[PDB]
Amino acid sequence: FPRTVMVNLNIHSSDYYNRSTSPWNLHRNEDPERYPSVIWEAKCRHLGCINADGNVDYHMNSVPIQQEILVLRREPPHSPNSFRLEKILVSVGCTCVTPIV
Amino acid sequence: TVMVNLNSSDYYNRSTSPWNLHRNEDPERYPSVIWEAKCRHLGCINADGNVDYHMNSVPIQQEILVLRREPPHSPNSFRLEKILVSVGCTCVTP
Amino acid sequence: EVQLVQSGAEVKKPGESLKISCKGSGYSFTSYWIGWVRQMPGKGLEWMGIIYPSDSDTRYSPSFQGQVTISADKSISTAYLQWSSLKASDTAMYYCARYPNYGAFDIWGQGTMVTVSSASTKGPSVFPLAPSSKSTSGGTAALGCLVKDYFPEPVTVSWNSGALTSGVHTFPAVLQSSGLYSLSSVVTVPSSSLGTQTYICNVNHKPSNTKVDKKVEPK
Amino acid sequence: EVQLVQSGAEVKKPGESLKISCKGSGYSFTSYWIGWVRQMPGKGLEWMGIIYPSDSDTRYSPSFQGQVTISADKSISTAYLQWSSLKASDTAMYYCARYPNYGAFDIWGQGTMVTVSSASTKGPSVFPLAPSGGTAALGCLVKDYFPEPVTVSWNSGALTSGVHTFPAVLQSSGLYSLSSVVTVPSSSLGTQTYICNVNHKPSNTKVDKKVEPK
Amino acid sequence: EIVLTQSPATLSLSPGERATLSCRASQSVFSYLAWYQQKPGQAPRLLIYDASNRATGIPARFSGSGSGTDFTLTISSLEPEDFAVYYCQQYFYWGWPFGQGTKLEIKRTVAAPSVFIFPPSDEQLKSGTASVVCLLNNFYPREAKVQWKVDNALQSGNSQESVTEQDSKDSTYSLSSTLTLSKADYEKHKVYACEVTHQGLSSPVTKSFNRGEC
Amino acid sequence: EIVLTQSPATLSLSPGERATLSCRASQSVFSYLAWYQQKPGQAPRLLIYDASNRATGIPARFSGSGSGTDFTLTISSLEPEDFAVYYCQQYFYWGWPFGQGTKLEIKRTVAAPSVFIFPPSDEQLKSGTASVVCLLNNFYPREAKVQWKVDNALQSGNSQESVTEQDSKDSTYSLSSTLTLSKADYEKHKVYACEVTHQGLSSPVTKSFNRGE
């Protein structure tokens, strides 16, 4: 609710990306003016999904799972605030989706 | 302390590792609401629509930043905190 | 302080309903799950079920589905466990415990003991477990008192008003099918002590203001 | 201001190498992907490939793999597109564009025009398209120049109504040619002077041609 | 692996009319689809992202709809600045990102071209080449046929055409056709004619001159 | 459908010794595993979470390791307060969270019980019930089999056992077995025997009496 808040900056792993039927690669999204400076974002490797035989099955699809997260962005020098709070959408990994439920 | 200016999809259902979302609500946190996932099944749904026990649904967890009111109930002062949030589920080969 | 406080011990009759509570404080009750765990006397931990107080999502163990109902009132940070019709087999300690999604049970309630019995307050009958010449083990003799048919717990047992403590074994009480408790208290003594001194078990049952001093002698 | 600034227009001969750049500013260059898009004259948009400057992950369209190299220097917020041996078929506008992961191309560079030809810089010859009816037409034929572009105005910009300056055509000789025409009242032919002002900056050629009835 | 197809290739509508532009994917692209507008001499501009989100600063008359394989871009009421090329683009899997484009043209009444023929200038003929120019002025629709005849013989392979973009004031087109001959071939013939076929003319119009006459 | 099985059922060690406790899952639980300690009449206490992370305030001698299906809890050098029941718990999929528990008891040598049988008193025989008591005194290990025989017939369903906690001085157990009979059934038979099978006895011991003698 308040436009300006004081924030204390002092804060008090798996291989699913590889073993998934919808595997993904992680990319280091880096911004030195942001909290957090590094966010690991996922990009699906294939269009289809990997079947029991290790082949890509195109009857299903790999899709990214996106999550809305809070970030602090450094304001331009000498602004009334040091940071601005923003909400971004981050792909955290991939899941496999069928054509119908 | 720094001054801060405070200013979908049905994959959860059509996934072979589907999940349910739960409203994690905390009035002492910004954001007050975080939607967290819990996998529905132990296995994964196969091409025939059945749950395949040879595969596993596992949650995908993501570390996120949140603001915690400090001191408690404060509307204008917070401490930065890192929490782990389950966002959805994927199917893994064992 | 982050804690879970459970409601007090319960003594109910078979067929009666019961709702026990688990109140959280010092944390967001709508940010974690609550699990309910049963522990029968001297046995392991058995999961009964869970609840996410924010939306009342509940899951049950197959052994408890249809036998209990788990619920929550998030306005007062409280979770509940309820039975429609109690049975003697529901006599056990019940714990509630907090856990975050895909996390361990990190905060535990103190437990709620639930006893299910048709009995009302009753003092014990104290019978002797007499030493026998034909029942000696080498140069040793055993004697005791059977403290039978009392309700509720506890009873205290001393020997010779506290003067005799070595070799004494006072067993934990068992809840009989009748709904009354029973226990034995025994002592091993040298056979040579049988004729030189007296043996008396002092039984106190405070719930009934009962006190029994039973002399134990060779029959 | 969030922007992508591309390097200037290029005029090259076949067989020559070329590296063009795309510099980002006003945003985190290591938080977004960069895509390279080709557009041949009068044609659609063709994807060439992408790069994630933070880790130099690079992918190419199967149509361009082995023909170009895409790279990035995150220390100077710049992405590059390069050819080891240019061909005439590489004559096209090249755009770079930013996109977040699973997002649209929201910021576009201004484009880099690349012309590849064996032809050399040459100024145009300007010939009159003499007038001679309700309306009369006259013009200038701006022939045999390289490279594009030429600018044409009439009466130093005082005559704009009825002017049609056609797009240039590339002749088989490798030189361009265009016409600029104007429809004027027949009654003005003996009274009003008509001059087409042609400028070809690449060869520093300026021609002011008077157009009159033969 | 994924191909986008736009329909129609060209949409001709009047200002004020509602435009419906189609984009079909070969398989689902979920909602990872964007629409772009491209004006001549300009980079593409993001209009809609995520199938239906208007980009900041984009007029409310533009709207996107669809999911999976079928998408639509609608312009509720056509403004003159909306006549441009539109592209759809998927960012789900590459695959092929872009649609081939849909060109929006202004529809107006049929207008016949005014036709003019220009002989080569004497100055050009000294250099050994002769360019004969035929101008087709202010016509609609764009479809027009120009045939060159030299002493009544139909010419083939020796002419190039150029056409202007739709006029901002009257929505018509203009076209120039240049016939190129050597000075020797030009001097062997007498009658130079350009015959124009266009929807606005009941019968084809011929404009001609005799070499050496005025 | 996930079940955790702990081994051994009882771990017998001395203070100062290194303890190794095992937990096997029927299928992978990844690293969604915890260990708890439980002392009698007390709630479980979290020791390790996420297979290897020590909870706050837990001493460094406790360590956890493993992933997938096999997990270990190690106590580097046992303190007296470490003798308790230990449970492993998975929070991947329920399934069943808890293992059956491993009792970590104080080691000592095998000691056979001294066995005693007590007939029902005359005072109790004035009621409709007769209690026959069998005492197994100061024995180790805890595993013992007590069978009641009435005129050589094995009794079933009419006896209850009670056991003490490990003795603070000698580390032994004691056990009572009470046979509850109706006074009618008691008077119908003559020989009452308590038979005891234990590791410390080469053959089972019988203590018996004849009713009325």
Author numbering:
A (entry chain J): 18 to 29, 40 to 128
B (entry chain K): 21 to 27, 40 to 126
C (entry chain B): 1 to 219
D (entry chain F): 1 to 132, 138 to 219
E (entry chain E): 1 to 214
F (entry chain A): 1 to 213
Sentences from the paper on this structure:
Using a small, focused library, we engineered AAL160, an anti-IL-1β antibody, to bind the unrelated antigen IL-17A, with the introduction of seven mutations. The final redesigned antibody, 11.003, retains favorable biophysical properties, binds IL-17A with sub-nanomolar affinity, inhibits IL-17A binding to its cognate receptor and is functional in a cell-based assay. The structures of the 11.003/IL-17A and the AAL160/IL-1β complexes highlight the contribution of germline residues to the paratopes of both the template and re-designed antibody. This case study suggests that the inherent plasticity of antibodies allows for re-engineering of mature antibodies to new targets, while maintaining desirable developability profiles.
To elucidate how relatively small changes to the sequences of AAL160 CDRs resulted in a strong and specific binding to IL-17A, we solved the crystal structure of the 11.003 Fab/IL-17A complex. The complex of 11.003 Fab and IL-17A was crystallized and the structure was determined at 1.9 Å resolution. Like all other anti-IL-17A antibodies of known X-ray structure to date, 11.003 binds IL-17A with a stoichiometry of two Fabs per cytokine homodimer. While the four binding interfaces are very similar overall, one interface shows additional interactions with IL-17A residues Thr33 to Arg39, which are stabilized by crystal contacts in this case but otherwise disordered in all other IL-17A subunits. The 11.003 epitope on human IL-17A is mainly located within the first and second β-hairpins of a single IL-17A subunit. Structural overlays show that the four antigen-combining sites in the asymmetric unit of the crystal are highly similar, with essentially identical CDR loop conformations. In contrast, superimposition with the parent AAL160 antibody reveals significant changes in the conformation of the L1, L3 and H3 CDR loops. The conformational change of the L1 loop is particularly worthy of note, as 11.003 and AAL160 differ only by one point mutation in this region (Phe30 to Ser). Of the 21 residues in 11.003 that are in the 5 Angstrom interface with IL-17A, 13 are conserved in the AAL160 paratope. Interestingly, the structure of the 11.003/IL-17A complex reveals multiple water-mediated interactions in the antibody-antigen interface, including interactions mediated by the germline residues.
